[PDB]
Amino acid sequence: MERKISRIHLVSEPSITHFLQVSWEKTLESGFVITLTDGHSAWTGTVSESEISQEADDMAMEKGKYVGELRKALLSGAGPADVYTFNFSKESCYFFFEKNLKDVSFRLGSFNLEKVENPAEVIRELICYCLDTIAENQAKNEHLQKENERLLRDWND
Amino acid sequence: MERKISRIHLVSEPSITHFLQVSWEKTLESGFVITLTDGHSAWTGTVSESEISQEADDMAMEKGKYVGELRKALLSGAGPADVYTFNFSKESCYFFFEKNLKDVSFRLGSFNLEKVENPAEVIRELICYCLDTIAENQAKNEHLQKENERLLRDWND
Amino acid sequence: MERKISRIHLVSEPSITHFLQVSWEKTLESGFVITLTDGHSAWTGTVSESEISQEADDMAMEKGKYVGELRKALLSDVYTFNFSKESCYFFFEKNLKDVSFRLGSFNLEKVENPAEVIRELICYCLDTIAENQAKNEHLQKENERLLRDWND
Amino acid sequence: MERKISRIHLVSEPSITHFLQVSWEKTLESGFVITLTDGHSAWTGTVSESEISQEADDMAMEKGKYVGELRKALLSGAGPADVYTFNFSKESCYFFFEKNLKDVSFRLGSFNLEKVENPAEVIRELICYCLDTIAENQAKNEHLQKE
Amino acid sequence: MEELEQGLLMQPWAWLQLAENSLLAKVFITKQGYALLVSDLQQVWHEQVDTSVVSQRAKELNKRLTAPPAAFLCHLDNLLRPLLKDAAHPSEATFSCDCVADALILRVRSELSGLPFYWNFHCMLASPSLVSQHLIRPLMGMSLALQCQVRELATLLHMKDLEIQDYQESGATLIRDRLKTEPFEENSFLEQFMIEKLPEACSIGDGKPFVMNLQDLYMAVTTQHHH
Amino acid sequence: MEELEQGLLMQPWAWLQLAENSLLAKVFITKQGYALLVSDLQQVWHEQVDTSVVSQRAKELNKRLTAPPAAFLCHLDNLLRPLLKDAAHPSEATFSCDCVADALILRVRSELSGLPFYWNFHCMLASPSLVSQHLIRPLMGMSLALQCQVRELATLLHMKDLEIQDYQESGATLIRDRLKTEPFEENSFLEQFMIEKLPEACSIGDGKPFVMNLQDLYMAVTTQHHH
Amino acid sequence: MEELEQGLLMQPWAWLQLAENSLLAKVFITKQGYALLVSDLQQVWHEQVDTSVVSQRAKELNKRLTAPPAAFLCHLDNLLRPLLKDAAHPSEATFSCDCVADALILRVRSELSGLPFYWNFHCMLASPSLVSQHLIRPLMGMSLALQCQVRELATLLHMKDLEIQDYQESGATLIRDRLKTEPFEENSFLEQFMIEKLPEACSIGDGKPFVMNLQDLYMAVTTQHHH
Amino acid sequence: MEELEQGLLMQPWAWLQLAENSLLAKVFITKQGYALLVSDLQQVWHEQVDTSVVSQRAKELNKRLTAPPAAFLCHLDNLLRPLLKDAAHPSEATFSCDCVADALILRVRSELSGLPFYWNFHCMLASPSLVSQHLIRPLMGMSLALQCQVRELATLLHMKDLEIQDYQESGATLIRDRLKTEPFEENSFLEQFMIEKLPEACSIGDGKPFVMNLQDLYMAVTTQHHH
């Protein structure tokens, strides 16, 4: 459902590239089905359009200033200076991503996510789709490569 | 080290997929490395050069006839409607494959692979890899598409 | 003991004729008294029953026509006789194109008393020949007289 | 040259049954041959013309009854009791025939025949004269009967 | 002495009224022995013999007889005529036959000059290369030759109908509807045959038919091979 | 295993060419095994396999294979049938047979799905009972039966003579002159056939003709005998 | 010698029949030989041979014959005895008697029992004594005795003459006067006899008479004298 | 000297005795010489002489006598009388004889004229051919012919009995009773003689009967015995 895996490092236990996957349906401001893993574990959790709307108070700012930061941190919104040290405890299942700033920092979004007892079934879904994401590009490159070759017999026919 | 991850359907989990990775040098017959999994503990094995010739010879085929025959099976290089059974007993942990026909199979090739020393790195190495390749192709497809016109738009300039 | 003469010929002496009498008792199977001579010496043999029955069987011949064969080989080119003196065995086979074969042969024992033998034969052989005239003329005149009859 | 054989008896050897033959052209008077056999040894002789008269006269009978009364012995002429002096001396080789009739011994004919060089030869030949003509008389026994 | 066999081939088969059985064979006799080949359509047989064994077996059967080794075959040869010759005969020559594991005895036993003339036949199981040159191969050619005979003969039957055309295509009606014969349609005739004649035509019976109406050809074929 | 053999009879011959001369044969495969029978018209060869003896050689000559006993036989014909009915089978079949020591082995090479397929037919000189049952016996029937065709065609070929001759003798008319069909006579015909065409007909040869232009009748001949 | 002799005496003459002048003879033949005697009214001849001379003589006359001497006699007597009763009787033997010197032969050529006989009688001159004892002496007795009869008859005639005389003379009577037997006077009876009768009655001729019309008396007178 | 003999023949015999025996002698005499003959019933003796010889004897016997031959014989004839020519004086000069040797000497003394006239008869045994001319033949005739003396008497005797009867009827006067002679029966007669008379009627004795009787006849026969 329009996902977007994101290679994420945990500050708690670094050196373990986790895999944060945000699956937003159409409008992202409404509903945030989230799932995380590390190649053995697994996590779920969903933040309805309400859990985000309220967050406008936590960050005490309109939905605009909020949602923006979201995509930049989770949905990878780039940033030549925009940094986010993802951090979260497993023994409590509390996800939080703060926006690192010169000497300072502060948590932005939160997720009352919960662990899931189906690592296999889960990881499979990710690997299955992840295999296509990288594969679909290969098939795209092949045909989009033979097209950058036709310009040869055309630039002078 | 070119991989070739593909889905399977072992008799163990005839319902649950079973991703199988395959690494090697420039030529597959020089000694490839197969690594199966399922999102929970994988399996890695090695195949020496002369070890495959041993496999080929005993099949009543020739080096080439077998080599190419392998990629058609152990690489899902075969079409969709094709039929290649891959069973893997979780006990003995023995991997093998056969070509289906009129109730007739063939022990083309088969090997053994110790249990995975750690499901973490293995399953992740895969996913982490699938993301690199899918990204490498994006900067190449966002390039080829953009350049598809930059090399045809103004053939005069 | 009705006798029977008939002269044979031995290949042991292809020139000097011989004689072989055979006095049988009614049937030929029952046996008889065959004897060989030459006008100087004799050889008498006695082949009675029990010895003939084991001939057509020992020679595979069929008794149905065997005893009959003996009638043409013991009392008249076919059939030849071969008897050697010291051999004291009257060997005879049925001569025929290509080959012939044995028919029995008894060990005709000689006779230390030729005179009586060579005599008894002639003494009686004077009937079949001379006494035949008694029946010869009875038809030589009776038939040569009936002539004028069928012309009456 | 026809001929006739006949059973005989010698005085020297009674049992020994001798047999005489002798052949001749057409006339027993024109001389002939003589031959006797005892079933072992022969005994032949020969006649002559100048002797056919040396017999009829020597006796007391005319030339008419020459072989007349003689053919009643060597030819089975012995009637109801008619005998005939028939004897021959072996070691002497002297033959003789003197009509015997009541104590008499009328000399009629006597020859001088003797043993033959080949005995076994003649005896067999004699048998032939029997086995030869026998088939002939039989060849007429049924022939003339049903001509 | 491959001389014997050479003649055995030409000599066609025949029938033989065995005491109990019945088999079609072929025999070739010479002054130095014979080479008889017999069969009952279920399995062939053969026996080679040379002067030696002849006289040897002679006295072992015809003990009362003492005949020269070579002359025997000469006489016996003339005795064997219940085949080629008239189907009648052979007097009292009753052929006795008994089988015992690849072995086949043909105890002849007849009469000779009025005497008990005996003689046996020690014919062993015929060899492959043999059966091939007497039954299989030769005969096979016949059927292959007859077929070619039917076509050329039947095709000539077509010319008869082709000629009849001109006569019929121009009135001149026949004088007797009798002779009027239906047009010969090769395909038709050949399909009905396999439903009327063949059912009893193929019947090999006991081989008797084979000999009574085929040897004329058989010989002309088997001989044509070595030429 | 008898129901098997029966079919080995109904099966028509077929001349399979090989790297080493040609070999005549007729195989009848089922599930309980098969029934082969080859020959070079000089010697016959049998072979009555069975489920068991099938694997002892199957899984014995095709190590890397998980092919069941029976199933193996079916996959066999795809390499045989499209090869025994003619010579249009892909070169993916050496079929280089060899033989010696009184026996004959049918070395069969081929493939399935690309994977090399090996297998042989351990044959041995056919027994007497068959040497005839599949040749001598049925082959003779063809002769006796085929002859009936000629004898029957000649009669209908002669029946035509009556018709065509009736026209001229009575009606008296002309025709095309070309179709001056000469009268018929089985004798005048046979002789011309023998001294001119018989040879080129009764040509056993390798054996190809026996089937390519006769094998047909064969089946009908043997079929009329048993069933 | 006594028997044979005294017997010849008791023999009456007979006279047989010889080609030339027969001779009155009388032969008494016994078993122990014989002793005959023959004379011709001029000379007498006696020969008394015996057993010895019998065989001897026979062996010379009929050497071509044989027979016992003692018995021989009977067979010889048979030829003479008949001619001793009557010369005419069955001769059965021609005699050729010849005399000379003092002896006289009697060739007796005859035939007995179909077997021609032969015998001789070498007789001799009769001794003085015998010439009488058989003739002289006895013969005189007859002539002398016969006389008495003539005398007595004469005597009887006279006594009868007286009888007839006593009647005619004394009795004075007559009769027929025919048969008047004149007075017999012997003196005249003789003077008439010896002159008209004596001749044709005294002639001896060839002894023919003595042996018949008188022979009886001779024997009678002979037996009287001696024996 | 036929003369003497001839006369001696027809000369009757005579009886003369010596002392112990007598002889019957017939002596014929004549000047030409004498011929005598004498016998004693047994053997005859004859001695004819000639005139010449006479001389010597007459001389040597009658010494003192002198008489010529011829004249002497006659003077000697004086013997025929003393010879009892008719049974006269038998002893008037007794005789003598000596039957010595073969000859017979007959001495005859006498007394011619009272003068002793002696003489002897040198007689010699007579010859056979001489006894048959003086005794045998001649004497036989007497008996043979004398048979008629009896024969003629028989008739004449029987002829009387005939004449006798003619008186028996024409009378019966039989004067002399003892004269009736019994009827002669020729049969019974000849019989009764050879029964009672003959025994002593044929008795010769010494010859005396012969002379004193038959002499009258004898002569007639000896004489008639010629023509």
Side-chain angles (χ1 to χ4, degrees), chain E residues 26-139:
Chain E
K26 46 212 288 144
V27 74
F28 201 79
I29 302 179
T30 192
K31 328 292 184 62
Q32 315 79 32
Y34 63 67
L36 164 69
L37 174 83
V38 193
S39 177
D40 65 4
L41 303 196
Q42 177 68 173
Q43 51 183 47
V44 199
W45 280 300
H46 175 35
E47 173 200 44
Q48 173 72 177
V49 173
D50 52 65
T51 53
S52 179
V53 265
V54 192
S55 218
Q56 181 277 76
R57 199 186 277 171
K59 194 269 254 52
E60 290 201 323
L61 290 159
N62 315 58
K63 47 208 177 56
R64 77 128 49 171
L65 165 56
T66 292
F72 193 123
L73 303 151
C74 315
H75 211 325
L76 152 61
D77 179 298
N78 298 45
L79 161 156
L80 282 177
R81 292 286 86 261
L83 22 282
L84 159 68
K85 236 252 285 190
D86 62 70
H89 286 65
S91 45
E92 73 171 308
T94 310
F95 284 50
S96 297
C97 191
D98 181 284
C99 192
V100 256
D102 311 307
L104 218 265
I105 178 64
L106 217 57
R107 293 158 230 238
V108 176
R109 202 282 124 181
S110 82
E111 192 167 50
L112 206 60
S113 181
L115 301 311
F117 181 26
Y118 283 55
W119 178 231
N120 285 0
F121 276 110
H122 281 65
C123 283
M124 294 159 249
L125 213 308
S127 44
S129 194
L130 176 64
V131 177
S132 165
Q133 264 304 87
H134 281 297
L135 275 322
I136 313 300
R137 294 197 35 172
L139 189 130

Side-chain angles (χ1 to χ4, degrees), chain A residues 7 38 137-138 141 147 151, chain B residues 124 132 137-138 141 148:
Chain A
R7 205 178 309 183
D38 64 2
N137 264 65
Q138 285 289 60
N141 207 59
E147 197 158 77
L151 302 180
Chain B
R124 283 200 301 279
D132 291 306
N137 270 24
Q138 280 305 56
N141 267 41
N148 220 40

Side-chain angles (χ1 to χ4, degrees), chain E:
Chain E
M1 43 180 81
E2 258 96 15
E3 158 185 340
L4 226 313
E5 232 68 339
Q6 184 61 202
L8 170 72
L9 249 184
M10 283 57 272
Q11 259 230 182
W13 309 74
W15 209 48
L16 222 294
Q17 64 308 313
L18 286 176
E20 211 170 316
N21 275 174
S22 53
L23 32 62
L24 54 118
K26 46 212 288 144
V27 74
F28 201 79
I29 302 179
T30 192
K31 328 292 184 62
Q32 315 79 32
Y34 63 67
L36 164 69
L37 174 83
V38 193
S39 177
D40 65 4
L41 303 196
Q42 177 68 173
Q43 51 183 47
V44 199
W45 280 300
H46 175 35
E47 173 200 44
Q48 173 72 177
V49 173
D50 52 65
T51 53
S52 179
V53 265
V54 192
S55 218
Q56 181 277 76
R57 199 186 277 171
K59 194 269 254 52
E60 290 201 323
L61 290 159
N62 315 58
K63 47 208 177 56
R64 77 128 49 171
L65 165 56
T66 292
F72 193 123
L73 303 151
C74 315
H75 211 325
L76 152 61
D77 179 298
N78 298 45
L79 161 156
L80 282 177
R81 292 286 86 261
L83 22 282
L84 159 68
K85 236 252 285 190
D86 62 70
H89 286 65
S91 45
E92 73 171 308
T94 310
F95 284 50
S96 297
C97 191
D98 181 284
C99 192
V100 256
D102 311 307
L104 218 265
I105 178 64
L106 217 57
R107 293 158 230 238
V108 176
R109 202 282 124 181
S110 82
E111 192 167 50
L112 206 60
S113 181
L115 301 311
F117 181 26
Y118 283 55
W119 178 231
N120 285 0
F121 276 110
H122 281 65
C123 283
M124 294 159 249
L125 213 308
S127 44
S129 194
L130 176 64
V131 177
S132 165
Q133 264 304 87
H134 281 297
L135 275 322
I136 313 300
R137 294 197 35 172
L139 189 130
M140 178 237 237
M142 304 182 83
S143 282
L144 247 197
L146 253 190
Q147 171 83 153
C148 304
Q149 210 183 60
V150 148
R151 254 48 186 172
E152 195 212 300
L153 164 141
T155 192
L156 176 64
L157 207 171
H158 177 68
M159 301 313 258
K160 287 292 185 178
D161 270 299
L162 219 181
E163 187 188 69
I164 288 171
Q165 230 53 75
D166 212 302
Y167 288 98
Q168 299 189 297
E169 296 186 327
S170 307
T173 290
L174 204 65
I175 316 306
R176 307 83 173 172
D177 57 66
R178 301 183 176 70
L179 309 81
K180 188 205 193 69
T181 59
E182 238 72 69
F184 176 34
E185 232 294 281
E186 188 182 50
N187 205 68
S188 309
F189 158 74
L190 291 168
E191 191 166 5
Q192 57 85 195
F193 190 93
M194 321 291 239
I195 326 169
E196 299 168 58
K197 295 309 295 282
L198 174 149
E200 188 191 299
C202 162
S203 165
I204 193 177
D206 79 346
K208 188 173 172 61
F210 174 25
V211 40
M212 230 53 258
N213 57 81
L214 281 182
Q215 304 321 115
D216 313 282
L217 164 64
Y218 178 86
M219 290 184 286
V221 190
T222 73
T223 60
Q224 176 66 190
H225 286 150
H226 305 57
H227 297 171

Side-chain angles (χ1 to χ4, degrees), chain B residues 55-70:
Chain B
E55 279 279 16
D57 185 21
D58 266 349
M59 259 290 269
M61 315 174 141
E62 193 223 303
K63 201 64 170 63
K65 173 168 284 182
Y66 184 73
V67 178
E69 169 68 352
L70 212 60

Side-chain angles (χ1 to χ4, degrees), chain D residues 54-55 58-62 69 94 98-107 110, chain G residues 61-68 71-72 75 110-118:
Chain D
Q54 206 72 54
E55 284 283 40
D58 291 9
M59 51 172 109
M61 251 292 155
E62 52 178 57
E69 27 214 276
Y94 185 31
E98 300 171 358
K99 267 216 65 171
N100 181 289
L101 204 66
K102 275 193 285 77
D103 303 67
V104 194
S105 328
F106 183 58
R107 168 77 70 63
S110 62
Chain G
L61 319 170
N62 42 299
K63 202 172 185 177
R64 290 275 160 172
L65 187 142
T66 310
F72 177 96
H75 232 213
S110 54
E111 288 149 51
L112 280 293
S113 195
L115 336 174
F117 212 96
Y118 249 121

Side-chain angles (χ1 to χ4, degrees), chain C residues 69-81:
Chain C
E69 289 281 296
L70 289 154
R71 296 191 190 292
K72 200 187 175 189
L74 285 90
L75 37 135
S76 268
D77 290 295
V78 59
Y79 303 109
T80 196
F81 309 80

